[PDB]
Write a protein that binds this ligand. Structure first.
Ligand code: CLA
Ligand code: CLA
Ligand code: CLA
Ligand code: CLA
Ligand code: CLA
Ligand code: CLA
Ligand code: CLA
Ligand code: CLA
Ligand SMILES: CCCCCCCCCCCCCCCC(=O)OC[C@H](COP(=O)(O)OC[C@@H](O)CO)OC(=O)CCCCCCCCCCCCCCC
Ligand SMILES: CC1=C(C/C=C(\C)CCC[C@H](C)CCC[C@H](C)CCCC(C)C)C(=O)c2ccccc2C1=O
Ligand code: SF4
Ligand code: SF4
Ligand code: SF4
Lengths: 61, 118, 75, 738, 150, 39, 80, 144
């Protein structure tokens, strides 16, 4: 999918960083359901700055 | 295990608790009830006489005190009856606790009546 | 429950209130709600809650039912 | 071997770590991402256990911290003396103590606040102070403002020395761990040098400066005309003119003919009748005795020579059949855990402050203090509050020890272990006795309210109906009044007027009279017992179940301060020992508010007042009114808040403003106490959206306060509000009717 | 409760100053909150708290008792609103131990296991005591002041 | 000295200096212009 | 008994398993994530609902959820 | 690996006896019994309060709830590096083994386990509460 270092936008509506911009770390090329690893500069309520997303949940914008 | 203590595991305390009528293991529940009632009604007759609302009116302090004590003994016997009705569905059975509550009623009213004479 | 509540208000006013005395001078006579039977009372309380014009201890109503009933035709 | 052990130059003095907030914590030095960080930065700033595991570095940190505290206190004392010298009416007050109000604060004439500078007398305008510094200064023999100014400069110099000592003993020459662990030497030096030499040098100052100057002040001579103290030291013939013992010098001291020093080392007792304070000769003998006693006490523990006791040997020697190993292991605990020491010292320091309050109201030690009713009320109340806070702190740091420092593989079948091992029995018995006390103590008040309301006063618990006389306290009172005749032959009077006896009055006001004890005093004392027992229940339960309970078996791993363990198992909110400190704080407030109300009403009703017989401030209403809640509500609160509610347009208007403000802050606390941070976080989410819409969302993410910070903010504003309310009430009342 | 307390303090005090005659008292004292606390709460609760006293009682003693009754229920609701569950659950566990170990009373045993109140139940019970004490306090004060002074 | 000015650039120090400046400015205005209600 | 569910966003970090104070969860073989590990809740009858598992989960949103259901003697954490 | 059995004649750790021990739940409902084999004699903290010396060899303690046995298991497993196991005992004498019910501890994957209570969807893909109204009981929409 998207490449390393590119900026994407999250469309998972029950996420902390929905409708916000992060940075792709890696995309796993196996049959994993959520391969897109996106870091965010701000943390959520659990103090986490990294989440895994699917292909149709990220838009390179 | 349980904490070993000279209050919970004293010999003379264990014999004294074995001699009290809640523990004799072989007397009738009616006899346990009448002995516990003759103790408790006789002791409950006191403060209603000495401290109640009619305590300073002569010739009627002991009457109203014993009458309120008898009413309280009747309330306690009703409490025993509903406890046995809710609990079990020789002393620890429905028939045994009903006999125990009736014996407590009889013994408590007899203790109040004996405290009125005394 | 609502109609039983209203019937109870009417019954305790009719039996324990001063409604037939209130309607003659409604400026100077206090409306009585219901009589007091409290065996925990003492004689100063029985004397002080016997306000007027009552036989024994009564409560003075603030619920305003005498004005409403006298306006809609109760006498 | 006890010796000086110091490491050279541990920490460089540099401004680098000032420019890096949260340097002390590995978690907090990463920087701020959300707003929670800030609060964490201030909450854990002085929690040195969470900084390092090394006991030495922690010990050094607390040492320099203590130096910082002492320097701050010296700045405070310097300020009080300077304000007493430059912005006060102290000399005028010295000329006429009975008709001039002590004032040492003046406000500037802006926005109308000038009205607070009231007519305190002496041709002065300011705020009347109730700290009692004027009486302390007159008792010390100070007569001029110059001496106070010099004391201010001296205290400022000492503050600079304390801050230098802090910087020096942290950054240049910081003591080693085994220096701090010399507890035997520390006790010897503090019992001899601190308490002993302290009271010795103070008795020196008293005998040489206080006694002659205050004897002349009681004689009536103008303060400016009294000889300066250095002339009292220099020419001993004047000292022989007041007390002929001084003619013989120190010859009766060394020859053991001490009886000739009975001119200035007395045992009179009672109060100075023209002055209303304890005799300074009694206080001088007292401090000499105290000095000799403590210097004897300070030579008990072995240091660098064979003689002397050993603390671990005395502890390990007291073992019985009921307790097993007894006091074994306690020495190791109290020489390696700062929190255990802090808990013990806080408990005894708070208790000591409460004892100070009672002994200073009952036996007024300063001249013209007993008749300055505002000062007496203020001092008692203040030191009682300080006491209570330090006791709650003791329970807090006890629990902190229990979670962080407790280690049973050096502490195995011990006093502490058995306490932890029968804690259920302890807490259940305390529980029952608290319910018993509550039922019978409070139930008498409710009973009285009901009987009084039902028109049956003859059925109440009172002095005329069903009496409940404090026979034991009355017997102890009578015994202590009869004590000078038989069991204390060399005493001229009793130690306090409140035992019984005559009446000492100064300037038309009652200094002290015999305090009678009836059914109302019985009822309030059992209320006090109840509230104290409940407070002990909460705090002690907090410390005994800090590690584990049947509900949370592994509570120790969750820490000392944590919100809960989730809504499961029915709900585990406020299971942490910190939350037990939080509830103990509320209950301590309850207890001490009833205590200071007892003191205030009782003093204004049965003790204080003018002498014509004695007309009391409230006419003696205590004995009949303090048996119902309505009586406290009407005759105390409602009646005595007249002064505060009508203080507007005068110099006491600030007490009305702080009355309203304190009520406001108290109510403001309820928002934090009654709610929870989930709601507030979601509200903040909406507000954050609004800020995002206008490109004003901060980079540091707005977060609702934590659960424990919500509780902390709650209890802090609650305490501030309530205490300040009673403060404004008390001060306005007693200054206006005093 | 706060908002209706504001509207009823306001209604009651403006009508008390109307019924007495001096509306100038409300016009002068309602512009500052000390005037509220002095001239509506302190002033109009003199005959209320004198309903019973060590000199006797009168007809307003029931409203004085209900006034204190409401202050007490309010204060008791503060306990459920401030203190939360796990303290009470540990306390009840110690009580369960104390009942099961006491001789001659452990022959009587509960059928329902005693636990503490739940969190939602705590909020409801605290708000209930809070509101009942609020209503009884203000109803006692309002009825007693308006009936005693007119 | 760079680190001391960085510390003086921190949030509570600047809030203290700025509120001292703002409060002092208001105090001097209310001194030289006593009690302004209008204009 | 409470309701504990596992969702397919699990990355098999095992954090939830090592957080439960009651041993309710365990890790099973799976092929949906790189770790080839998924949580599972075969013993929800002993679950008290403390929600330590939800605290330990790193994913956004949660992959383990505890719905407080009917209470029993085991779910109330009663030792009596 | 096979399921072990309870030896009732296993020596208990050295402990003077607490007030936080068993209650009538042990006699009427159940009590849980923990067992481990120690390498040396060493003091541990009892989860019901107090210190106790374990014996060299097998040990045996009985607790009132499961969380006490997990707390002692976690303590003996992280601090002492031991492998305990605790059972479930009924007043009839019925013994129910668990933890590790697989034999391998649940904090690492083992073949043969069957996944229970696994929804194969996201949490945002749950249905609305209108879709599960008027069933036989209360239902959260995550139940389906
Ligand atoms: C809790 C405090 C308290 C106390 C001490 C009292 C006391 C009294 N009340 Mg009051 N009352 C109270 C609260 C209290 N009340 C409250 C809160 C209210 C409002 C709800 C009232 C409303 C009220 C009314 C309306 C009246 C009273 C009356 C009385 C009097 C007689 C009551 C009576 O006969 O009971 C009977 C007494 C007992 C059953 C005693 C039981 C307690 C025993 C002694 C415990 C023994 C424990 C023992 C030491 C253990 C030994 C163990 C060993 C054997 C192994 C008595 C002086 C009456 C009165 O006329 O007042 C003068 C009356 O008419 N009260
Ligand atoms: C004046 C020169 C000076 C300099 C440059 C330093 C520098 C340092 N000190 Mg040292 N030290 C000094 C003097 C100095 N100190 C003094 C006078 C004391 C005695 C108090 C100490 C005792 C000391 C201790 C115990 C420790 C340090 C530590 C440190 C280091 C980090 C602390 C920090 O950055 O926060 C700077 C802190 C502040 C700027 C706030 C000051 C708080 C003041 C003292 C409290 C009083 C304010 C007062 C109550 C007013 C309140 C009014 C109202 C709002 C309530 C840093 C190298 C720490 C360290 O090395 O950790 C590894 C450490 O633990 N110092
Ligand atoms: C320790 C307790 C203490 C307290 C509560 C007070 C309180 C007061 N003093 Mg007193 N005073 C004290 C000690 C104290 N003083 C000491 C130790 C001295 C000897 C130095 C004095 C000498 C003194 C004089 C000569 C006067 C007062 C005055 C006053 C009154 C007004 C103060 C004012 O507005 O200053 C002005 C306000 C400021 C200067 C605000 C500036 C604060 C800065 C910007 C903070 C910057 C933060 C910084 C990092 C930390 C400070 C570092 C520091 C080294 C500057 C006030 C009642 C005045 C008075 O009583 O009038 C009748 C007055 O004339 N004081
Ligand atoms: C007999 C000598 C002596 C005296 C008078 C003191 C006095 C004190 N020590 Mg102790 N201390 C001593 C010996 C002494 N110490 C020894 C031998 C040890 C090692 C075993 C310690 C280890 C020690 C520790 C770890 C701590 C103290 C602290 C204190 C202070 C407690 C605060 C207080 O309430 O005082 C009332 C306040 C005063 C009376 C102010 C006057 C103080 C001046 C400086 C006179 C005290 C004499 C001083 C020791 C001489 C210093 C000379 C120096 C230039 C070398 C108090 C000032 C605590 C403290 O607060 O440290 C800052 C503290 O944490 N001491
Ligand atoms: C503890 C504090 C204290 C202090 C500081 C004093 C001090 C004094 N007392 Mg007092 N006294 C005290 C407690 C104290 N007393 C108590 C508790 C009692 C009750 C028992 C008394 C009862 C009492 C009586 C009855 C009398 C005194 C007297 C005195 C004075 C002379 C004593 C003397 O001759 O000592 C011996 C001399 C010394 C100890 C000399 C000090 C050492 C010097 C300073 C060393 C200098 C060395 C240095 C290298 C040289 C300077 C060099 C430099 C210039 C470069 C002296 C001012 C007498 C007096 O004058 O009354 C007004 C007197 O008659 N006292
Ligand atoms: C000898 C006195 C003493 C000392 C040295 C300590 C020391 C400590 N306490 Mg202890 N404690 C004490 C007494 C003491 N305490 C008292 C009297 C209480 C009862 C309130 C407690 C109750 C207590 C609790 C519940 C806790 C501590 C904790 C701590 C530790 C960290 C504190 C910290 O960094 O907070 C930083 C300091 C602050 C945040 C100060 C703000 C405090 C309030 C908000 C200010 C009060 C308002 C003020 C008086 C006036 C405001 C005026 C105006 C602005 C409106 C530290 C070891 C904590 C800990 O975790 O220990 C390991 C902890 O949780 N203490
Ligand atoms: C005025 C309001 C109020 C009242 C009545 C209580 C009452 C109590 N608190 Mg609570 N508390 C309060 C405010 C209050 N608290 C607040 C605001 C907080 C938050 C800070 C707390 C937080 C708190 C803690 C942390 C603890 C308590 C505990 C207790 C109990 C103490 C045991 C006792 O003395 O039993 C005696 C009962 C009473 C004094 C209540 C009144 C009884 C009346 C007068 C007589 C009863 C007879 C009655 C009239 C018959 C009615 C019949 C009718 C139903 C038909 C007691 C029930 C403690 C506890 O439970 O341990 C033992 C405890 O640890 N409370
Ligand atoms: C939030 C509501 C509120 C409002 C609208 C006011 C308004 C006012 N207050 Mg009040 N006050 C308030 C709350 C409020 N205050 C609170 C909460 C307190 C307690 C802390 C006070 C306590 C108080 C006092 C003691 C005094 C005032 C005064 C004033 C007047 C000041 C005019 C001024 O500052 O000069 C003009 C200000 C400036 C020129 C500064 C602005 C600078 C810019 C650049 C000007 C731009 C203009 C174009 C003004 C009418 C003073 C007064 O005399 O009232 C009649 C006065 O002495 N207030
Ligand atoms: C009476 C207490 C005697 C206490 C007493 O005599 O202890 C003495 C007893 C004997 O101790 P040993 O001789 O073994 O002590 C050896 C060393 O450990 C101490 O030097 O110690 C105990 O057994 C503790 C058991 C406390 C049992 C509970 C007592 C609780 C009493 C609470 C009521 C107090 C009310 C009044 C408070 C002011
Ligand atoms: C009101 C309330 C909040 C909200 C309160 C918050 C978020 C604190 C707000 C403090 C200030 C107002 C915010 C920080 C201000 C900064 C210093 C910004 C600078 C402002 C300048 C004017 C100096 C909670 O978070 C909470 C949490 C748990 C239980 C109860 C409650 C609770 O009752
Ligand atoms: S979150 Fe607040 S409420 Fe929910 S459990 Fe933890 S503490 Fe109790
Ligand atoms: S549930 Fe959360 S924590 Fe447990 S495994 Fe799946 S992801 Fe890791
Ligand atoms: S809730 Fe408590 S028990 Fe249920 S899973 Fe999360 S942790 Fe394990």
């Amino acid at each position: 999918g998207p490449k390393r270092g590119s900026l994407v936008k999250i469309l998972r509506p029950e996420s902390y960083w929905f409708n916000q911009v992060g940075k792709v770390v890696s995309v796993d090329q196996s049959g994993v359901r959520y391969p897109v690893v996106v870091r965010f500069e701000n943390q959520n309520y659990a103090g986490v700055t990294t989440n895994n997303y699917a292909l149709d949940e990220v838009v390179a914008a | 295990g349980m904490l070993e203590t000279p209050v919970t595991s004293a010999p003379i305390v264990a014999t004294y608790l074995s001699n009290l009528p809640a523990y004799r293991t072989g007397v009738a529940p009616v006899l346990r009830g009448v002995e516990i009632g003759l103790a408790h009604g006789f002791l409950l007759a006191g403060p209603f006489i000495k401290l109640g609302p009619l305590r300073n009116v002569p010739e009627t302090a002991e009457i109203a005190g014993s009458l309120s004590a008898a009413g309280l003994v009747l309330i306690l016997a009703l409490c025993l009856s509903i406890y046995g009705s809710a609990q079990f569905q020789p002393l620890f059975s429905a028939d045994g606790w009903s006999e125990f509550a009736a014996g407590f009623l009889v013994g408590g009213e007899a203790g109040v009546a004996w405290a009125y004479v005394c | 429950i609502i109609f039983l509540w209203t019937s109870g208000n009417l019954f305790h006013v009719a039996w324990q209130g001063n409604f037939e005395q209130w309607v003659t001078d409604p400026v100077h006579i206090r409306p009585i709600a219901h009589a007091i039977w409290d065996p925990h009372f003492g004689q100063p309380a029985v004397e002080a809650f016997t306000r007027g014009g009552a036989s024994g201890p009564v409560n003075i109503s603030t619920s305003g039912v005498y004005q409403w009933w006298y306006t809609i035709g109760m006498r | 071997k006890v010796k000086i052990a110091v490491d050279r130059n541990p920490v460089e003095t540099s401004f680098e770590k000032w420019a890096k907030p949260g340097h002390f914590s590995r978690t907090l030095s990463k920087g701020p991402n959300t707003t929670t960080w800030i609060w964490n930065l201030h909450a854990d700033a002085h929690d040195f256990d969470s900084h390092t595991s090394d006991l030495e570095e922690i010990s050094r940190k607390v040492f320099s911290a203590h130096f910082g505290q002492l320097g701050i206190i010296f700045i405070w004392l310097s300020g009080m003396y300077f304000h007493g010298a430059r912005f006060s009416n102290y000399e005028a007050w010295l000329s006429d103590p009975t008709h001039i109000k002590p004032s040492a604060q003046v406000v500037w004439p802006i926005v109308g606040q000038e009205i607070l500078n009231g007519d305190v007398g002496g041709g002065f305008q300011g705020i009347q102070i109730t700290s009692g510094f004027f009486q302390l200064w007159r008792a010390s023999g100070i007569t001029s403002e110059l001496q106070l100014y010099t004391t201010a400069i001296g205290g400022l110099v000492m503050a600079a020395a304390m801050f230098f000592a802090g910087w020096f003993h942290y950054h240049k020459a910081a003591p080693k761990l085994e220096w701090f662990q010399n507890v035997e030497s520390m006790l010897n030096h503090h019992l001899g040098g601190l308490l002993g030499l302290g009271s010795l040098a103070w008795a020196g100052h008293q005998i040489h400066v206080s006694l002659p100057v205050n004897k002349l002040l009681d004689a009536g001579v103008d303060p400016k005309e009294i000889p300066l103290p250095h002339d009292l030291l220099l020419n001993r013939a004047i000292m022989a003119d007041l007390y002929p013992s001084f003619a013989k010098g120190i010859a009766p001291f060394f020859t053991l003919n001490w009886s000739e020093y009975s001119d200035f080392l007395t045992f009179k007792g009672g109060l100075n009748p023209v002055t209303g304070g304890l005799w300074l000769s009694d206080t001088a003998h007292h401090h000499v005795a105290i000095a000799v006693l403590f210097l004897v006490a300070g030579h008990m523990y072995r240091t660098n020579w064979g003689i002397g006791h050993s603390m671990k040997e005395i502890l390990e020697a007291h073992r019985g059949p009921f307790t097993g190993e007894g006091h074994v292991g306690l020495y190791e605990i109290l020489t390696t855990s700062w929190h255990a020491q802090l808990a013990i010292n806080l408990a005894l320091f708070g208790s000591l402050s409460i004892i100070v309050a009672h002994h200073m109201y009952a036996m007024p030690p300063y001249p013209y203090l007993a008749t300055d009713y505002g000062t007496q009320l203020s001092l008692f109340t203040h030191h009682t509050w300080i006491g209570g806070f330090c006791i709650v702190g003791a329970g807090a740091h006890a629990a902190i020890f229990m979670v962080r420092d407790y280690d049973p593989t050096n502490n195995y079948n011990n006093l502490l272990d058995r306490v932890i091992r029968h804690r259920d029995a302890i807490i259940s018995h305390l529980n029952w006795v608290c319910i018993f006390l509550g039922f019978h103590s409070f139930g008498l008040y409710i009973h009285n309210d009901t009987m009084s309301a039902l028109g049956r006063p003859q059925d109440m618990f009172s002095d005329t109906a069903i009496q409940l006389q404090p026979v034991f306290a009355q017997w102890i009172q009578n015994t202590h009044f009869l004590a000078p005749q038989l069991t204390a032959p060399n005493a001229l009077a009793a130690t306090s007027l409140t035992w019984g006896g005559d009446l000492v009055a100064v300037g038309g006001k009652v200094a002290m009279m015999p305090i009678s004890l009836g059914t109302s005093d019985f009822m309030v004392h059992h209320i006090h017992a109840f509230t104290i027992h409940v407070t002990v229940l909460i705090l002690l339960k907090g410390v005994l179940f800090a590690r584990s309970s049947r509900l949370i078996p592994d509570k120790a791993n969750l820490g000392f301060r944590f919100p809960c363990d989730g809504p499961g198992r029915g709900g585990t909110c406020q299971v942490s020992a910190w939350d037990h400190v939080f509830l103990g704080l509320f209950w301590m407030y309850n207890s001490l508010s009833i205590v200071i109300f007892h003191f205030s009403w009782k003093m204004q009703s049965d003790v204080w007042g003018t002498v014509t017989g004695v007309s009391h401030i409230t006419g003696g209403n205590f004995a009949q009114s303090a048996n119902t809640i309505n009586g406290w509500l009407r005759d105390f609160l409602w009646a005595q808040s007249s002064q505060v509610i009508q203080s507007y347009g005068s110099a006491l208007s600030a007490y009305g403003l702080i009355f309203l403000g304190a009520h406001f802050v108290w109510a403001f606390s309820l928002m934090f106490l009654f709610s929870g941070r989930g709601y507030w976080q979601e509200l903040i989410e909406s507000i954050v959206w609004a800020h995002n819409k206008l490109k004003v969302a901060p980079a540091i993410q707005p977060r609702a306060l934590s659960i424990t910070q919500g509780r902390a903010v709650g209890v802090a504003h609650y305490l501030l509000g309530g205490i300040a309310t009673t403060w404004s009430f008390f001060l306005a009342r007693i200054i206006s009717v005093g | 409760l706060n908002t209706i307390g504001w509207v009823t303090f306001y209604w009651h005090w403006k009508h008390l100053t109307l019924w007495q005659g001096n509306v100038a008292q409300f016009d002068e004292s309602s512009t500052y909150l000390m005037g509220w606390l002095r001239d509506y709460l302190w002033l109009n609760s003199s005959q209320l708290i004198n309903g019973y006293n060590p000199f006797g009682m009168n007809s307003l003693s029931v409203w004085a008792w209900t006034f204190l009754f409401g202050h007490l229920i309010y204060a008791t609701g503060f306990m459920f609103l401030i203190s939360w569950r796990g303290y009470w659950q540990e306390l009840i566990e110690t009580l369960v131990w104390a009942h099961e170990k006491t001789p001659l009373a452990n022959l009587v045993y509960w059928k329902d296991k005693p636990v503490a109140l739940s969190i939602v139940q705590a909020r409801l019970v605290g708000l209930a005591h809070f509101s009942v004490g609020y209503i009884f306090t203000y109803a006692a004060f309002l009825i007693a002041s308006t009936s005693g002074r007119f | 000295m760079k680190d001391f000015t960085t510390y003086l650039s921190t949030a509570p120090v600047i809030a203290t200096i700025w509120f001292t400046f703002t409060a002092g400015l208001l105090i001097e205005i209310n001194r030289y212009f006593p009690d302004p209600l209008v204009f | 008994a409470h309701i504990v569910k596992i969702y397919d966003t699990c990355i098999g970090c095992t954090q939830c398993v090592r957080a439960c104070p009651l041993d309710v969860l365990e890790m099973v073989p799976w092929d949906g994530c790189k770790a080839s590990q998924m949580a599972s809740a075969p013993r929800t009858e002993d679950c008290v609902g403390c929600k330590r598992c939800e605290t330990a989960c790193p994913t956004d949103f949660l992959s383990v959820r505890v719905y407080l259901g009917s209470e029993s003697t085991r779910s109330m954490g009663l030792s009596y | 690996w096979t399921v072990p059995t309870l030896n009732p004649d296993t020596p208990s750790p050295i402990f003077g006896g607490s007030t936080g021990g068993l209650l009538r739940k042990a006699q009427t409902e159940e009590f849980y019994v923990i067992t481990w084999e120690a390498k040396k004699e060493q003091i541990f903290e009892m989860p019901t309060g107090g210190a106790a010396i374990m014996r060299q060899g097998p040990n045996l303690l009985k607790f009132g709830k499961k969380e006490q046995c997990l707390a002692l298991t976690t303590q003996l497993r992280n601090k002492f590096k031991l492998t305990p196991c605790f059972y479930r005992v009924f007043p009839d004498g019925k013994v129910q083994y668990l933890h590790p019910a697989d034999g391998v501890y649940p904090e690492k994957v083992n073949a043969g386990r069957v996944g229970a209570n696994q929804n194969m969807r996201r949490i945002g893909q749950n249905v609305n509460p209108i879709k599960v109204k008027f069933s036989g009981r209360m239902m959260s929409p995550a139940e389906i």
